[PDB]
Amino acid sequence: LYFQGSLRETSEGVILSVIVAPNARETKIVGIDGTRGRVKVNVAAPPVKGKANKELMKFFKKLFGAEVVIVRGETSREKDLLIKGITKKEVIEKLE
Ligand SMILES: [Cl-]
Ligand code: NA
Numbered sequence: 001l002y003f004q005g006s007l008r009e010t011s012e013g014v015i016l017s018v019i020v021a022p023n024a025r026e027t028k029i030v031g032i033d034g035t036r037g038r039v040k041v042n043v044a045a046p047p048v049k050g051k052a053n054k055e056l057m058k059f060f061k062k063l064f065g066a067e068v069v070i071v072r073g074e075t076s077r078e079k080d081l082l083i084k085g086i087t088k089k090e091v092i093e094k095l096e
Contacts, residue, residue, distance in 0.1 A: 001029070003095045005037040009088040015071065016081045016091060020056060022047040027059045029095065038078060039095070050074075057081070064094050 006017045017038045021030075024042035031040040041059075045051040053070060056079065061068045066083045073079035083091060 001032055001096070003032065003039065003092055005034060006032060006039045007088055007091055010082075013066070013082055013084040013086050014088050014091045016060070016083060017078070018056070018081060019078050020047075020052055021077075022052045027055055036078065053079075064091060 008015050017036075018041045019033050019036055019038040020041055020043045022043050022045060024044045026042065027044045028042050029039055030042050032038075033040050041056065043052045043055050043059075045055040053074060057068050057070065060081055060083070064083050064086060066086050069082050069084070071080050071082045
């Protein structure tokens with residue numbers, strides 16, 4: 001997997017662009033959507049009541065060891081996550 005099309009480094013940190021597939025057995029990175037420039041993430045939650053947002057952010061805060069917030073897409077499948085205070089190098093190392 002090449003994650004460089006799904007990330008950009010901003011003033012505040014790194015914006016990781018994902019597309020969520022809900023209702024999964026396990027939350028996990030499964031591939032790259034190159035048409036969207038987004039990481040495909042299976043999410044073990046239903047897509048109701050913010051449960052997929054909660055699971056998604058829990059999984060990524062654990063992975064990066066950084067504050068993760070949804071900056072765009074709270075009610076979309078295509079969510080942009082700001083990982084505050086981190087470089088793109090560090091995020092790519094963690095995604096790999
Ligand atoms: Cl910027
Ligand atoms: Na949700």
